[PDB]
Design a protein around this ligand. Sequence first.
Ligand code: NA
Ligand SMILES: [Zn+2]
Ligand SMILES: [Zn+2]
Ligand SMILES: [Zn+2]
Ligand SMILES: [Zn+2]
Ligand SMILES: [Zn+2]
Ligand SMILES: [Zn+2]
Ligand SMILES: [Zn+2]
Length: 197
Amino acid sequence: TFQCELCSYTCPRRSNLDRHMKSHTDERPHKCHLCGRAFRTVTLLRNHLNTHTGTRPHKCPDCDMAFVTSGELVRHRRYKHTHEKPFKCSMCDYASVEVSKLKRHIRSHTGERPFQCSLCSYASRDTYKLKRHMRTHSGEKPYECYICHARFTQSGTMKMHILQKHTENVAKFHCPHCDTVIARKSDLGVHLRKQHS
DNA sequence: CCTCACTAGCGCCCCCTGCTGGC
DNA sequence: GCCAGCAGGGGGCGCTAGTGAGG
Ligand code: NA
Ligand SMILES: [Zn+2]
Ligand SMILES: [Zn+2]
Ligand SMILES: [Zn+2]
Ligand SMILES: [Zn+2]
Ligand SMILES: [Zn+2]
Ligand SMILES: [Zn+2]
Ligand SMILES: [Zn+2]
């Protein structure tokens, strides 16, 4: 095989070896004109132009969804149709379509929290979980109830609000040991831990 | 030396679950 | 108890930068 010897890359073919050498140049000739982004190859620029237009030539056969690139279609089929999960955990039976989700799962086994909050001691196992935690410091309430226009910090909190205040005839939870009617399952658990040990 | 799939990595957002603490 | 705040374990998509290989 051929050896790049700059990043220790091996490739049996001679055309892909020369293509890999162009990866080190870090110069982007092809420039979009709608925006300022520049690209290395025409194929990436053409895909970028398709994202502007919304043109999605890669159409899934099993549903009415389409994607700009063939890679997105492959991931979609694994998520929705084939249910192939190539990346498997070595400590349990969990498997994921993508690497980052397996790595997120692995940090649950180990307890690693590599994403530190810059305002307090909190640290998360997910980058996006840190963003959600930031709303505790900024006081942001991105979600709004479409009925009473109340605002909430989490989407799931808003959904519970709609169920418990705008939905009629919702089954409630009855305490097994006393005649107490409780609307929320978690509040029933609190009631059991308080007046029933 | 084309061409299109497949891979790796970044980001986005939501889901459900279940608890906490002010009221 | 009611209620919004809030964290933990997850799924699915948007977009880019590469690689593998039939042709
Ligand atoms: Na396993
Ligand atoms: Zn190299
Ligand atoms: Zn553009
Ligand atoms: Zn599909
Ligand atoms: Zn595991
Ligand atoms: Zn913080
Ligand atoms: Zn409401
Ligand atoms: Zn009771």
